[PDB]
Design a protein around this ligand. Structure first.
Ligand SMILES: OC[C@H]1O[C@@H](SC[C@H](O)Cn2cc(-c3cccc(F)c3)nn2)[C@H](O)[C@@H](n2cc(-c3cccc(F)c3)nn2)[C@H]1O
Length: 138
């Protein structure tokens, strides 16, 4: 449905209790997926499944400030499957982003960028077909 890369505005920034849902299908032979929550040119939260990093599947999370990447947080639990449909949910909590894939908790990422109201765009990129991207308050 939707064109990738896709930019989803987050009007007024993120706030605790905001739930973002992304539905799509991983392409065959996919190499990478990325979600980038942006504060202007900075990336507050980069969520990056990698299908083949030295023959391993890994999720890399990080923050980019002033064009420099910080310390990576890596997760070896890998719920994505080439060719198959997925659901990503990102719930904004007071102290972290909480990510679930296919209704199962995956990881939390502590807020490094603390001006939550200034994180006002989400970029979706990589080797997917994107079906829907939306948000709501819970
Ligand atoms: O930090 C996140 C950034 O990472 C760099 S790569 C640096 C390597 O991760 C560094 N590194 C660390 C280790 C290591 C860790 C533990 C133990 C050990 F032994 C070794 N090995 N290598 C990427 O270019 C960068 N990016 C990805 C994309 C991007 C663009 C379109 C689609 C998409 F899907 C993605 N745009 N920009 C970002 O993802």
């Amino acid at each position: 449905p939707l064109i990738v890369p896709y930019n989803l505005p987050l009007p007024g920034g993120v706030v605790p209790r905001m739930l973002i849902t992304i539905l799509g299908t991983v392409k065959p032979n996919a190499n990478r997926i990325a979600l980038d929550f942006q504060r202007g040119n900075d990336v507050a939260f980069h969520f990056n499944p990698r299908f083949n990093e030295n023959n391993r599947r890994v999720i890399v999370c990080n923050t980019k400030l002033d064009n420099n990447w910080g310390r990576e947080e890596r997760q070896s639990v890998f719920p994505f499957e080439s060719g198959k449909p997925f659901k990503i949910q990102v719930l904004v909590e007071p102290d972290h982003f909480k990510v679930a894939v296919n209704d199962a908790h995956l990881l939390q990422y502590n807020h490094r960028v603390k001006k939550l109201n200034e994180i006002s765009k989400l970029g979706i990129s990589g080797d997917i077909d994107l079906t829907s991207a939306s948000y709501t308050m819970i």
